[PDB]
Amino acid sequence: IFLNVLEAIEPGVVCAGHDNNQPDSFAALLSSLNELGERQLVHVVKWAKALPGFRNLHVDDQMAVIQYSWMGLMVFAMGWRSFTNVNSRMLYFAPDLVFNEYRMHKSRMYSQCVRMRHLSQEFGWLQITPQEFLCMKALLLFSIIPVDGLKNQKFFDELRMNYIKELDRIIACSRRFYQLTKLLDSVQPIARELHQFAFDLLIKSHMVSVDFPEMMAEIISVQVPKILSGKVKPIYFH
Numbered sequence: 001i002f003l004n005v006l007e008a009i010e011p012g013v014v015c016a017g018h019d020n021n022q023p024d025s026f027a028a029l030l031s032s033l034n035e036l037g038e039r040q041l042v043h044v045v046k047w048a049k050a051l052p053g054f055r056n057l058h059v060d061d062q063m064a065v066i067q068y069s070w071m072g073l074m075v076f077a078m079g080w081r082s083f084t085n086v087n088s089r090m091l092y093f094a095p096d097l098v099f100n101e102y103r104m105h106k107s108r109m110y111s112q113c114v115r116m117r118h119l120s121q122e123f124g125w126l127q128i129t130p131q132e133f134l135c136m137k138a139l140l141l142f143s144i145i146p147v148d149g150l151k152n153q154k155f156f157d158e159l160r161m162n163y164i165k166e167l168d169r170i171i172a173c174s175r176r177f178y179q180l181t182k183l184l185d186s187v188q189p190i191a192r193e194l195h196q197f198a199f200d201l202l203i204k205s206h207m208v209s210v211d212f213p214e215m216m217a218e219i220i221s222v223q224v225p226k227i228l229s230g231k232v233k234p235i236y237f238h
């Protein structure tokens with residue numbers, strides 16, 4: 001039942017709308033990454049709200065965790081696509097936005113991309129199944145909260161616990177749980193580097209010819225700083 005649900009609500013492919021007939025440029029690549037992220041958010045919200053038990057959370061907490069977890073969710077999903085689609089040879093951000101090393105360098109996000117490629121390879125090395133991927137991704141939505149707590153911390157704690165239990169079941173074991181939790185923890189530092197990058201870019205957006213979509217600009221200026229300043233922190237297993 002649980003896996004049936006995750007499979008059913010998994011979003012289809014989301015395209016960036018990038019012009020691949022134009023020579024690569026920092027401005028063009030970043031405008032496309034921004035647009036892609038904005039398009040993806042729309043689906044992340046619909047996805048999250050259709051997750052088992054998600055509606056139990058206080059309305060404010062729902063929006064909050066989606067926004068805090070947004071980067072991590074996409075890093076994880078992107079690494080999986082890269083693994084399944086091109087065996088981690090390139091970063092599959094979208095069917096029309098595939099990054100080779102040249103693009104990684106021109107985007108000025110090289111270090112972050114390399115780390116995501118390593119994550120992509122991990123899916124292969126650990127032979128992560130599509131079902132483990134789905135459950136781990138759902139768990140990622142419940143892996144970052146305010147140090148001060150949510151409006152209804154109890155409901156969140158209950159939900160996170162239940163999702164960990166579903167991962168347990170899909171595994172059923174100790175060694176596997178160790179690997180998977182270690183993998184999940186690895187997503188956080190990567191999302192952090194991207195959060196920092198996004199924040200720095202927004203602040204200087206008017207000087208690099210980059211354009212930021214409405215929702216993304218709000219989240220980067222309201223939510224991301226809470227993460228970078230340590231007011232909102234990921235939940236690590238280890």
Ligand SMILES: C[C@](O)(COc1ccc(C#N)c2ccccc12)C(=O)Nc1ccc(C#N)c(C(F)(F)F)c1
Nearest residue numbers: 033034036037070071074075078093194198219220
């Ligand atoms: C530079 C930027 O356009 C900034 O975009 C974001 C800024 C702040 C976020 C927050 N909070 C945020 C959360 C989620 C996605 C993007 C976000 C970018 O990184 N885009 C990007 C687009 C698609 C995927 C994918 N898949 C990824 C990937 F996750 F890194 F892989 C990255």
